[PDB]
């Protein structure tokens, strides 16, 4: 019967795997694992998670000039 | 500028605001917009006087893209060379462009037309006695060129191997080389009695391509691109019959060589003693003074120690001045020593026939130095709407990668990542459902996957025959005959063997499980195997192209890179993130989690005579 | 839309304020035109008789197949307090609003109107070349500021304060620049009458100072609606609150004035589109290669395309633009939904797009008449790509709050989860993981329940 500080996100298991390996890269990203589709992201870095996630998936995107 | 103050909304146009061009009062009749920045021509097709402008633009400009409503053209140097070669003087082009454009033609575009159209036909490469000469009617043009001196009315002989260097150098200078064969006035080479059979009909777009080639009464060396099944072979036969000189045809496969010999013997009045084949099995030559030889690029361009008979045949080919060479699948010519076939063979006219004029490197632009300018771009959608080729429904099925496969996908090297995203079980389910659905529709389906292990695994899971490189040729022929005739065989799995020029039965559906990186040539080659289906005469018939790709992987990047060429042709790849009836199919490939786990483990575990009795 | 918005705003007005609003005949005349046609018919049938009228007679007026419109008209009447129902002798007696009836009768028959339609001083200027030009200049100035194009002339701080304080057109001071919201681009979609009405309703929402009288402002708005363009009107008939909001409308472009603190003012065309409305410019072509050719020379229609189209070249006729991924991402980071973009692309589609879609639908219906398909005027590939980019922006959805776990007893976790389910703030519960999630706004209730 304890409490923590945290924020929830909803994602498919692919983006789950991305933020898992990002947690492996930078430790203070996620606190604990909820399902294959629910996470508990640290609220102080949720904007960092978005700003990193949208740039890493760009390598699957062809970007002509 | 024309003393025009820029508007407040001119900021986001990086010196591309062309509002200073005063619009003409009768602009609504005119179908053209001319951009002074790059010579890009914007043509509206719905307006009146559009086709009367469209033929003018396809004669003088290269079509970047041809959608339904607005057509986009590029004025380039080679298009202007082709335009002036067919007899269009500069003043006529400028006046017709001025008449047909809403905005007035800028002086930059006019000066570009002046500069590119002038100094044309100065330097000419002529061949005399199997020996190259570069010739100029003006004396000082020989003396002004002094940087690349490979010298061996005013003319000087260059070396045979340095013809490409000379053409590149003279393209760098403002004196492009005129490569045209006046076969009517060429009496040194012995002629041929080859002519088209009267029972053979030629479609109007083939006539248009040949009129691009033979516009001025002289055979102009260049490239004609046509879709698979549109009759590029017939265009080759017809050009050979037009030139009526000795013809050498280079193919990429021996089966293509036999097909070309069959098409020459069938479509035109060429006697078999005038024809010859240079392959491994066949090496005897025609004994007449002129005729046809058909061979392979690798056979002519073999730097290895060839046999004595092959050396004799190659000496015969090199010692004979050929009047015409047909380079089928010209996209493989810019290779390392496939480039040398245009130098080892002294041919007056060089025609390149292909369906995929793309390469993943920058060497595709070297073909104008090798063969010649792009003579004719076939409009694929015009041919599809006229029933000449099949009306394919291109699609891109998105297969969501499973959790465990994606977890293994992130922590792996690229080579293992490749096989790991090919063999995802959602792609198995999507391919199985598509095979079942299109087999219920009575469609002949060809499934393409470059990974051999994935090809075998998909074929064994779905119970369909597979064809790849190490399969015996008699087994390949038997499986092809079963696919063509047996109604129980409606799906055959093919590796990269099917991408190259081999004979295939007609198919109306296609599934691309895997691919070779972002090969646009392979992507368009696979599409060509369903573009020539017999059911084109049926109203409402559509062929189907499916590119099964795994979500959130590099397969999206490579699939988009491959589909770039097809959307440049004008095809619309509609994504499919949902197939209606996936859960309702009876048998699903790897539906259970334990089956998917077993598949994951399997994919991970994939990666003195008497002394002679001694010996 | 337009009539619904002003009807809801006049609904929000209290009854004693509405009765004061019915004094001026011009306000009653403008309000009367907002009512449904059945409501307008019943009001005008009920004005000229002074005696009170039964409701059952009005029920007998309406045919049996239009009773729902009769109920809508009665609800709109009763809620707007145009009717005072009376219960005498057991009959649902209906009486018209006396102030509204008197003012409307004076508006029609002519009489005492206390210059509710103003007074004309007969000195006039050209409407199309001066008044329409001034109105278009001010409107294009505020719209060009709002869409974000660079401007040598920016509108005054009153409309900047209004736009900052509106539901739309957000601004951040950390970067120092002014941003379009979803409602900012939504404001561009409707035609300028309800654009002006949304701006005026937001201004009416923000006139809460003691210097502003609500009834005088509404009288002035409907009075400007009643006037005719191209004729000056004397300012002396107005109040000082009405005078300074006339100055603010002159700032907004509804009305032209030759000089500040003049005795006359010239209403513009935007005053007369305030009542009701009345190839085209902005007509665009979409191809499968995401190229855009939008036949417009007005800088506003070019500037609104820069929100989501990577412009490449500009002619006098069109701008050559391309719908790229990054341009749509620029639109989506500003809150502009994919549906708004697709609606804009549909509403400005070329007639050639329309006829090609009609030909395709004609060929489709004769082949498969069993199924009917909607008119896909623009290619489905670009629509699907826009929606795909919308989805790829929203790959993750974030909710901040609290998750409660490590419960040794199942019953306490179940009780807390069902208490969170009752208050409607729960987003997840699961007994297998012993975890349940609540929103940040829903943290407080569950936390005080756990503490107490």
What's this entry about, in short?
The structure is cut from a larger assembly and holds chains A (65 residues), B (615 residues) and C (452 residues). Chain A is α+β, with helices and mostly antiparallel strands and 65 residues long.
Structure description:
- Chain A is an alpha+beta fold and 65 residues long.
- Chain A is 37% helix and 20% strand.
- Chain A has one domain (1-65).
- The radius of gyration of chain A is 13 Å and the shape is elongated.
- Chain B is of the alpha/beta class and 615 residues long.
- In chain B, strands 18, 19, 20, 21, 22, 23, 24 and 25 form an eight-stranded parallel beta sheet that branches. Chain B has a seven-stranded parallel beta sheet with strand order 13-14-12-15-16-11-17. In chain B, strands 1-2-4-3 form a four-stranded antiparallel beta sheet, with helices on one face.
- Chain C has helices spanning 3-12, 15-21, 25-32, 37-47, 55-61, 67-79, 98-109, 127-147, 157-164, 182-189, 192-206, 214-226, 240-252, 269-272, 299-305, 325-333, 338-347, 351-367, 380-393, 410-422, 443-451; strands at residues 53-54, 83-88, 91-96, 171-172, 177-178, 233-234, 255-256, 264-267, 283-286, 291-295, 310-314, 319-322, 397-404, 426-430, 435-439.
- Chain C has 452 residues and is of the alpha+beta class.
- Chain C starts with a helix and ends with a helix.
- Chain C is globular, with a radius of gyration of 28 Å.
- Classes of the chains: A alpha+beta (65), B alpha/beta (615), C alpha+beta (452).
- Chains in contact: A-B, A-C, B-C.
- The interface between B and C is large, with 37 and 37 residues.
- Chain B: It is found in: Nucleus.
């Amino acid at each position: 019967a304890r409490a923590r500080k945290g924020a929830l996100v909803q994602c498919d298991p692919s983006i789950k795997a991305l933020i898992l390996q990002i947690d492996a890269k930078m430790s203070d990203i996620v606190l604990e694992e909820l399902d294959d589709t629910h996470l508990l992201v640290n609220p102080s870095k949720v904007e960092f998670v978005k700003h990193e996630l949208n740039r890493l998936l760009s390598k699957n995107i062809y970007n002509p000039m | 500028p024309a003393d025009f103050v820029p508007d407040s909304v001119s900021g986001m146009f990086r010196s591309h605001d062309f509002s200073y061009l005063r619009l003409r009062p009768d602009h609504a009749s005119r179908p053209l917009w001319i951009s002074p920045s790059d010579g890009r021509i914007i043509l509206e097709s719905f307006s009146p006087l559009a086709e009367q402008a469209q033929d003018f633009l396809v004669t003088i400009a290269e079509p970047i893209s041809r959608p339904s409503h607005i057509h986009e053209y590029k004025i380039t140097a080679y298009s202007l060379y082709a335009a002036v070669s067919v007899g269009l003087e500069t003043d006529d082009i400028i006046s017709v462009l001025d008449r047909l454009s809403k905005v007035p033609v800028a002086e930059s575009i006019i000066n570009f037309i002046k500069g590119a159209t002038i100094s044309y036909g100065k330097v000419k490469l002529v061949i005399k006695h199997n020996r190259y000469f570069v010739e100029t009617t003006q004396a000082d043009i020989l003396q002004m060129l002094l940087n690349d001196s490979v010298i061996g009315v005013h003319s000087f002989e260059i070396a045979n191997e340095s013809v490409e260097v000379v053409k590149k150098r003279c393209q760098e200078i403002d004196y492009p080389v005129l490569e045209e064969y006046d076969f009517r006035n060429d009496h040194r080479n012995p002629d041929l009695d080859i002519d088209l059979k009267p029972s053979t009909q030629i479609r109007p777009y083939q006539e248009k391509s040949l009129s691009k080639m033979f516009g001025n009464g002289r055979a102009r060396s260049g490239i004609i691109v046509l879709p698979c099944g549109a009759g590029k072979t017939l265009v080759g036969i017809t050009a050979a019959c037009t030139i009526k000189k000795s013809v050498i045809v280079l193919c990429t496969s021996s089966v293509s060589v036999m097909q070309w010999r069959q098409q020459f013997l069938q479509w035109c009045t060429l006697q078999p003693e005038n024809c010859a084949v240079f392959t491994s099995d066949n090496k005897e030559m025609f004994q007449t003074e002129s005729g046809l030889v058909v061979s392979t690029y690798s056979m002519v361009a073999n730097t290895r120690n060839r046999s004595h008979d092959s050396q004799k045949v190659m000496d015969f080919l090199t010692g004979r001045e050929w009047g015409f060479i047909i380079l089928d699948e010209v996209h493989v010519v810019p290779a390392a020593m496939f480039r040398r076939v245009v130098s080892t063979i002294a041919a007056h006219a060089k025609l390149g026939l292909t369906a995929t004029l793309v390469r993943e490197d920058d060497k595709i632009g070297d073909l104008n130095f090798l063969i010649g300018p792009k003579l004719y771009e076939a409009n694929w959608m015009e041919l599809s709407q006229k029933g000449h080729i099949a009306n394919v429904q291109c699609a891109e099925v998105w297969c969501p990668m499973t959790a465990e496969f994606y977890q293994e996908y992130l922590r792996e090297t690229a080579r293992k990542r490749m096989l790991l995203y090919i063999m995802n079980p959602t792609k198995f389910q999507a391919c199985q459902f598509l095979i079942q659905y299109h087999e219920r529709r009575g469609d002949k389906i060809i499934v393409f996957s470059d990974n051999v292990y994935a090809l075998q695994e998909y074929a064994l899971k779905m119970g369909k025959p597979f064809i790849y490189g190490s399969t015996p040729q008699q087994e390949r022929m038997n499986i092809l005959q079963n696919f063509q005739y047996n109604d129980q065989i409606n799906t055959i799995f093919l590796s990269k063997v099917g991408d190259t020029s081999i004979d295939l039965p007609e198919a109306t559906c296609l599934i691309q499980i895997s691919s070779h990186y972002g090969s646009r040539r392979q992507e368009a080659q696979r599409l060509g195997r369903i573009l020539r289906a017999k059911r084109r005469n049926d109203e409402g018939f559509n062929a189907f192209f499916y590119s099964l790709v795994s979500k959130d992987t590099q397969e999206m990047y490579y699939s988009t890179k491959r589909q770039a060429f097809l959307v440049d042709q004008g095809y619309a790849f509609k994504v499919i993130t949902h197939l209606h009836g996936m859960e309702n199919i009876p048998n699903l490939a790897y539906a259970s989690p334990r089956e998917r786990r077993e598949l994951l483990q399997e994919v991970l575990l994939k990666n003195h005579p008497l002394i002679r009795k001694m010996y | 839309s337009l009539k619904h918005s002003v009807t809801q705003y006049l609904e929000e007005i209290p009854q004693q304020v509405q009765n004061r609003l019915y004094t001026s005949p011009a306000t009653c005349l403008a309000i009367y035109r907002i009512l449904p046609p059945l409501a307008k018919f019943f009001i005008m049938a009920m004005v000229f008789n002074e005696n009170e009228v039964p409701l059952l007679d009005l029920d007998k007026w309406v045919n049996s197949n239009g009773k729902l419109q009769f109920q809508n008209a009665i609800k709109s009447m009763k809620s707007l307090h145009l009717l005072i129902p009376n219960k005498s002798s057991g009959t649902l007696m209906i009486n018209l609003n006396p102030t509204f009836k008197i003012s409307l009768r004076n508006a029609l028959t002519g009489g005492e109107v206390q210059n509710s339609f103003g007074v004309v001083v007969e000195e006039n200027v050209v409407s199309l070349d001066l008044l329409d030009e001034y109105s278009a200049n001010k409107w294009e100035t505020i719209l060009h500021f709002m869409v974000g194009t660079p401007l040598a002339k920016i509108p005054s701080e009153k409309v900047l304060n209004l736009l900052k304080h509106s539901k739309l057109m957000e601004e951040v001071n950390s970067t120092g620049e002014f941003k379009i919201t979803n409602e900012g681009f939504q404001f561009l979609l409707q035609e300028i009458n309800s654009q002006l009405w949304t701006l005026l309703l937001q201004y009416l929402k923000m006139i809460e100072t003691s210097k502003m009288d609500l009834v005088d402002v509404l009288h002035f708005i409907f009075m400007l609606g009643a006037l005719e363009v191209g004729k000056a009107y004397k300012i002396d008939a107005l109040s000082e609150t009405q005078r300074i909001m006339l100055q603010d409308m002159r700032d907004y472009g509804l009305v032209f004035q030759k000089h500040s603190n003049d005795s006359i003012f010239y209403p513009t065309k935007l005053a007369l589109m305030l009542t009701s409305d009345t190839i085209p410019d902005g007509s665009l072509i979409v191809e499968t290669n995401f190229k855009i050719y939008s036949y417009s020379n007005s800088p506003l229609q070019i500037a609104v395309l820069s929100l989501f189209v990577h412009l490449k070249a500009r002619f006098v006729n069109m701008v050559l633009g391309q719908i790229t991924r990054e341009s749509i991402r620029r639109a989506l980071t500003n809150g502009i939904t994919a549906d708004q973009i697709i609606a804009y692309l549909e509403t400005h589609a070329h007639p050639q797009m329309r006829r090609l879609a009609e030909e395709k639908l004609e060929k489709k219906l004769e082949l498969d008449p069993n199924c009917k398909e909607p008119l896909q005027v623009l290619p489905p590939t670009v629509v699907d790509q826009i929606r795909l980019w919308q989805l790829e922006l929203d790959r993750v959805i974030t909710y901040e709050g609290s998750l409660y776990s490590d419960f040794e007893t199942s019953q306490e976790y179940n009780l807390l989860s069902k208490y969170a389910q009752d208050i409607g703030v729960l987003l997840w519960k699961d007994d297998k993981k012993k975890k349940f999630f609540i929103s940040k706004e829903g943290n407080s209730q569950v936390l005080d329940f756990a503490k107490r």
